[PDB]
Amino acid sequence: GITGTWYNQLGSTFIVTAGADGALTGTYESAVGNAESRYVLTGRYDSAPATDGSGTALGWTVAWKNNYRNAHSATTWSGQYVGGAEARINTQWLLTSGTTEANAWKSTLVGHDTFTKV
Amino acid sequence: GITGTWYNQLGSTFIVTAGADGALTGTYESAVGNAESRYVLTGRYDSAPATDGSGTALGWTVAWKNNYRNAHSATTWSGQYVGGAEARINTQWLLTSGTTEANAWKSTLVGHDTFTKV
Amino acid sequence: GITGTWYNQLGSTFIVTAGADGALTGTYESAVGNAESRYVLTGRYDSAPATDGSGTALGWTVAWKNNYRNAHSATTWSGQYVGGAEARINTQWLLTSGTTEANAWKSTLVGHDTFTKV
Amino acid sequence: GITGTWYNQLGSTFIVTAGADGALTGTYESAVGNAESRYVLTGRYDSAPATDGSGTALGWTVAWKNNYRNAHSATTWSGQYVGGAEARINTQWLLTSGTTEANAWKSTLVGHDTFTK
Ligand SMILES: O=C(O)CCCC[C@@H]1SC[C@@H]2NC(=O)N[C@@H]21
Numbered sequence: 001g002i003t004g005t006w007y008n009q010l011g012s013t014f015i016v017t018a019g020a021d022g023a024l025t026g027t028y029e030s031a032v033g034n035a036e037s038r039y040v041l042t043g044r045y046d047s048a049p050a051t052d053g054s055g056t057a058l059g060w061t062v063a064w065k066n067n068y069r070n071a072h073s074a075t076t077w078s079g080q081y082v083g084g085a086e087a088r089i090n091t092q093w094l095l096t097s098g099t100t101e102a103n104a105w106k107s108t109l110v111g112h113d114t115f116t117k118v
Numbered sequence: 119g120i121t122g123t124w125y126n127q128l129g130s131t132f133i134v135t136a137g138a139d140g141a142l143t144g145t146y147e148s149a150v151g152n153a154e155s156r157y158v159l160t161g162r163y164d165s166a167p168a169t170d171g172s173g174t175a176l177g178w179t180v181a182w183k184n185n186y187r188n189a190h191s192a193t194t195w196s197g198q199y200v201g202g203a204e205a206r207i208n209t210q211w212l213l214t215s216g217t218t219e220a221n222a223w224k225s226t227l228v229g230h231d232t233f234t235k236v
Numbered sequence: 237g238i239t240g241t242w243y244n245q246l247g248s249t250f251i252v253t254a255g256a257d258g259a260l261t262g263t264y265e266s267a268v269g270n271a272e273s274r275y276v277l278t279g280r281y282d283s284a285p286a287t288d289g290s291g292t293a294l295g296w297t298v299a300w301k302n303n304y305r306n307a308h309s310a311t312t313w314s315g316q317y318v319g320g321a322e323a324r325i326n327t328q329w330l331l332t333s334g335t336t337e338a339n340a341w342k343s344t345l346v347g348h349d350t351f352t353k354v
Numbered sequence: 355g356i357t358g359t360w361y362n363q364l365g366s367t368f369i370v371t372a373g374a375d376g377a378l379t380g381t382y383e384s385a386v387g388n389a390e391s392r393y394v395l396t397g398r399y400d401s402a403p404a405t406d407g408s409g410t411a412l413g414w415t416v417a418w419k420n421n422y423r424n425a426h427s428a429t430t431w432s433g434q435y436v437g438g439a440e441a442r443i444n445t446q447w448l449l450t451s452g453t454t455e456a457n458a459w460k461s462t463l464v465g466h467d468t469f470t471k
Pocket residue numbers: 008010012029030031032033034035064071073075093095113459
């Protein structure tokens with residue numbers, strides 16, 4: 001259900017595998033920001049969700065360090081998978097950048113991403 | 119610096135190992151919410167941080183299912199590791215429940231946790 | 237043209253008046269949660285925005301108490317007015333409920349609402 | 355008990371009076387950021403909170419423009435007042451900047467402020 005290739009509205013690409021385990025491993029590619037190429041991601045999801053039509057809860061993290069670049073920052077996404085004719089993953093995310101502590105008040109960005117199968 | 123046992127203001131236990139590749143592995147134990155004993159965590163962090171006194175960006179995830187129970191939910195922490203007088207990890211987090219499409223507007227909580235080694 | 241009647245994706249109604257001194261006044265009606273009928277709102281906005289195509293920052297608050305019910309909660313919306321063809325207000329919101337000390341960790345929901353005039 | 359002068363962990367000064375209609379009005383002076391002097395704030399609070407000892411739900415907004423500068427931003431604070439000897443106002447905030455559509459994804463900062471007397 002979750003395993004496969006997913007696209008968000010910014011055009012980043014998300015490529016995951018869900019292990020029978022509860023694990024999320026894959027790579028991420030961002031259309032925007034101080035990013036170039038694919039980054040390692042990792043996460044967890046509910047491998048035994050409710051069968052009432054409720055969504056499947058999950059999350060993952062990306063640190064923006066790869067051989068190409070280091071933005072000194074990390075994003076985590078927290079959301080739920082929703083199956084159907086139009087499967088979706090609706091998410092909210094937090095992007096934190098390393099700042100000195102005098103500038104810590106401005107270290108974190110928030111937003112939302114929606115990923116679809118097409 | 120990062121690897122070790124951390125406690126937050128809530129009394130939760132964050133047992134983390136920082137692998138040289140930027141991986142975070144370990145185990146989380148919450149003293150609040152619909153949870154008991156240890157849950158698997160995974161995450162990532164900036165393995166080559168900045169030297170200007172800036173802190174170290176990181177993030178991780180817990181999906182709240184183990185051998186004893188399943189809350190059908192997931193939490194992600196995003197924040198930064200700061201050295202100094204005493205070590206600390208400052209985070210903001212997002213916690214999403216699996217819900218129906220109708221209840222999704224109230225699926226996600228937000229907070230901030232401060233982890234220290236005491 | 238912030239002044240006017242808007243709706244979001246839940247079907248709630250946002251009726252506003254934007255002052256020349258930079259004030260926002262009006263009523264809010266929600267289609268979901270612990271609410272019925274109209275509620276007072278108040279906010280501020282940038283009265284002298286940038287003319288470089290940037291949107292106009294604004295924000296407002298609703299305390300969910302009127303003559304018919306009281307949910308012991310307040311929602312603040314923070315976002316911007318996008319002028320043009322399809323005028324929209326894009327927001328992110330924080331909904332805080334009054335809680336006991338026990339429950340403060342779970343006091344605050346985060347989400348996002350999109351308002352249009354259609 | 356919300357009325358008066360409050361300071362947060364950043365050294366900023368919040369001067370506010372709470373109206374009997376659940377109105378919040380006053381002044382904010384930020385110790386940090388693209389700011390100088392005072393700014394008008396306005397917001398709302400639960401004027402009949404739960405008598406179980408729950409905190410008092412509130413929020414306010416500051417747009418960062420005065421006669422000295424205009425930062426083209428607005429912050430909203432959402433939180434609860436908690437009375438008693440260590441009275442506090444515990445908040446989470448959203449700081450949104452005017453952006454072009456291409457940079458909307460990074461328009462909004464999130465933080466937390468604890469105000470104390
Ligand atoms: O630090 C950087 O600028 C790189 C971060 C990548 C941009 C973000 S992560 C949240 C949002 N969703 C995306 O697909 N891209 C942006």
